[PDB]
Subunit: 176 residues, 3 copies
């Protein structure tokens, strides 16, 4: 009872996907293999689609939506998330684009049109302005975010570690 | 069951009101016609009442409460309360857009035709002058809204009323 | 059904504890007497435990989790909260330690390793960095927080009243 339709739009689920019973997934939401949706999360893909790549976790209390229809976006815009992405607790993602191996710090807000490239870390409580592009391989922090410094190889490997740890984490629940 | 009581208080609902099955509305909460309460929203009107005007949307993940007595929450018509907004014992006029993730504190007063940027914080008792854009934590008055932006405030509410009806028809 | 087990770990509940039907409590979560868990709250004590002291309120929309397992903390770390603590609406607590008689302003984020001593007030929308220690008897505000000023005797008394009032409000809901 966690998946809901919007007109004739319904979530498409891959293999080993975990969606907490307390969460709400509405409309055109594509969840790739090993995606884990934790407690009290809302993902709404009504005016456009939401695409979440393999081995990506959407942590507790996050809210994911697409860009609404307006003069700037007559048909709105989708929310796209790559593979091995760690979306922290209470993160707000709105019609943005996130690449692969990205860690979005808990409590952050990513606005419409924002584009986050691969291997990027966003500190907790950050705000990414509309249409802002976050260059690959850097640490961003602040409200609004500022490019702080490039990530070390160890840090970049940690991005993969985070995604893998959460894949094992959701499997432990699908196992219970 | 999305409506719940508090003592002798229970929510009063107008016409064509949508309340997502995952939301929680408690106590003296008054929702006017065409109000739309989206997923995972909590509106608690126990310590005091919560009044929401016609054609106003309360988006996903918002949390609405009143001042802790030791002040009611009043929202006007055609108001767009963004996703994850925290409203606490404040007063909001008509045609106001509260940017997603914002926090409006006790005693705050927002006049008509105002836009608050996403992730902003409006301090206790702060009054936001009509016709301006405010943003920041705490908010700062940035600039007056253009006529197109004001029309945008109306469109935002209009669009969400249609959006609400879309779900009700299902 | 608000209590859920994580493997053979299950919440331990004291006397007169209120847990809203819309909330989610998972795993090793220990709630002392008179604790009140309000609507849409998630408390997850899976990799480690969450310990909440007596007469403490966890307000609507809060998200409580423990420090994740990592090369730094192989078995993770617990989230510990003292007695007479007021955790404001939408607060994010993550593997930190909070003393007694503390008020955490709504919308705040407290990160891993943070330590909040007794009789402290944190303003709404604040962010407490990892491992930061907040000295007893002061007001902290900001993102990241800064020590603003000492709390007045009136304010220190208010911390007690805040907790007391929420215990009363908790009971009103329990009796109905
Ligand atoms: Zn939206
Ligand atoms: Zn409150
Ligand atoms: Zn966590």
């Amino acid at each position: 009872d966690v998946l809901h339709p919007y007109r004739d739009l319904f979530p498409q689920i891959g293999q080993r996907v975990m969606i907490d019973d307390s969460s709400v997934v509405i409309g055109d939401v594509r969840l790739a293999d090993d995606v884990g949706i934790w407690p009290l999360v809302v993902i709404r893909g009504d005016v456009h689609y939401v695409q979440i790549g393999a081995r990506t976790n959407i942590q507790d209390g996050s809210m994911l939506h697409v860009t609404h229809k307006s003069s700037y976006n007559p048909d709105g815009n989708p929310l796209t998330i790559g593979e091995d992405v760690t979306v922290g607790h209470k993160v707000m993602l709105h019609g943005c684009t996130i690449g692969n191996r990205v860690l979005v710090g808990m409590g952050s807000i990513l606005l419409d049109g924002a584009i986050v490239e691969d291997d990027v870390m966003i500190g907790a409580g950050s705000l990414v302005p509309q249409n802002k592009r976050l260059e690959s391989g850097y640490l961003y922090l602040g409200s609004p975010v500022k490019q702080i410094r490039p990530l070390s190889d160890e840090e970049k490997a940690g991005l993969r570690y985070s995604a893998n740890n959460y894949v094992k984490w959701k499997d432990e629940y699908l196992d219970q």
